[PDB]
Amino acid sequence: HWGYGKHNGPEHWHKDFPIAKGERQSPVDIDTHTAKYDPSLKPLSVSYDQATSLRILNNGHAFNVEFDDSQDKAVLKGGPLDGTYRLIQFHFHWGSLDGQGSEHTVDKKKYAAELHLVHWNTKYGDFGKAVQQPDGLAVLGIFLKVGSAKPGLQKVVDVLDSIKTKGKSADFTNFDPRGLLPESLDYWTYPGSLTTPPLLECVTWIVLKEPISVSSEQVLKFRKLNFNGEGEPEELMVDNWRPAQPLKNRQIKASFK
Numbered sequence: 001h002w003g004y005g006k007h008n009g010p011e012h013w014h015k016d017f018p019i020a021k022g023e024r025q026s027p028v029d030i031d032t033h034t035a036k037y038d039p040s041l042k043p044l045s046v047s048y049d050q051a052t053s054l055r056i057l058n059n060g061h062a063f064n065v066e067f068d069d070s071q072d073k074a075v076l077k078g079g080p081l082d083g084t085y086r087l088i089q090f091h092f093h094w095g096s097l098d099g100q101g102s103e104h105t106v107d108k109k110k111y112a113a114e115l116h117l118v119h120w121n122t123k124y125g126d127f128g129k130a131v132q133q134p135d136g137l138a139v140l141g142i143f144l145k146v147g148s149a150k151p152g153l154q155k156v157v158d159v160l161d162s163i164k165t166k167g168k169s170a171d172f173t174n175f176d177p178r179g180l181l182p183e184s185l186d187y188w189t190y191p192g193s194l195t196t197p198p199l200l201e202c203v204t205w206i207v208l209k210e211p212i213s214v215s216s217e218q219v220l221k222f223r224k225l226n227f228n229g230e231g232e233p234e235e236l237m238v239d240n241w242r243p244a245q246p247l248k249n250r251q252i253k254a255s256f257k
């Protein structure tokens with residue numbers, strides 16, 4: 001089954017998921033000088049005040065903090081989007097070293113990690129239907145650099161000991177994802193895909209210009225997680241990122257000059 005190792009990693013995925021070589025794959029390099037300012041792009045509207053987190057899960061490729069998406073409680077609107085997208089989960093991708101870990105790159109620069117806040121278009125009724133549509137998901141991507149701690153991340157870091165291995169979950173209620181956002185909501189946007197199998201081409205990517213800083217101790221704790229299940233040989237969950245894919249017939253738009 002797919003993963004991030006030498007024998008089942010990103011270079012292999014196309015054999016089970018041929019869309020890996022498709023026309024709108026993610027992530028991509030964001031060439032800041034070639035991105036086009038679009039003065040008609042609207043500000044993002046991030047409405048997370050009524051967010052209801054439920055659970056945190058190690059799924060063997062990352063950890064997901066899951067939300068109640070059975071009502072419009074935490075929604076993303078505006079920006080390049082038409083309509084309303086509901087927050088279902090967030091997760092991260094990260095490296096074995098501080099100089100790698102992000103999926104998107106900026107002028108070929110890699111960040112230590114990348115946060116994905118995953119939302120689905122409510123006109124499609126459920127997440128499973130949404131991923132089958134070209135405008136089904138909106139993923140808000142936020143870069144992490146190592147420096148000062150992010151206080152709003154700490155509750156996530158503190159629970160990781162309880163979900164060390166694949167298939168473990170823990171209650172994770174009353175977490176406020178607003179504490180993970182940078183000051184600015186300036187962004188780049190382009191049409192792309194899920195960055196893990198099934199690699200479906202259903203995502204409007206919205207990548208924030210401003211990274212958040214996290215501490216070395218915070219990201220070290222991410223790196224103590226395991227890809228494996230309990231009782232299986234230990235394989236540290238690190239380098240769970242897909243590299244940049246060809247841009248092909250796409251232009252990245254910027255909300256800012």
Ligand SMILES: COC(=O)c1cn(-c2c(F)c(F)c(S(N)(=O)=O)c(F)c2F)nn1
Pocket residue numbers: 116118131139193194195196197198199
């Ligand atoms: C049963 O189905 C699942 O578990 C499932 C998981 N995903 C999923 C994914 F593959 C992905 F790459 C990204 S990303 N990294 O934000 O683009 C996501 F946000 C995802 F939600 N899609 N389907």
Ligand SMILES: [Zn+2]
Pocket residue numbers: 091092093116195
């Ligand atoms: Zn992701």
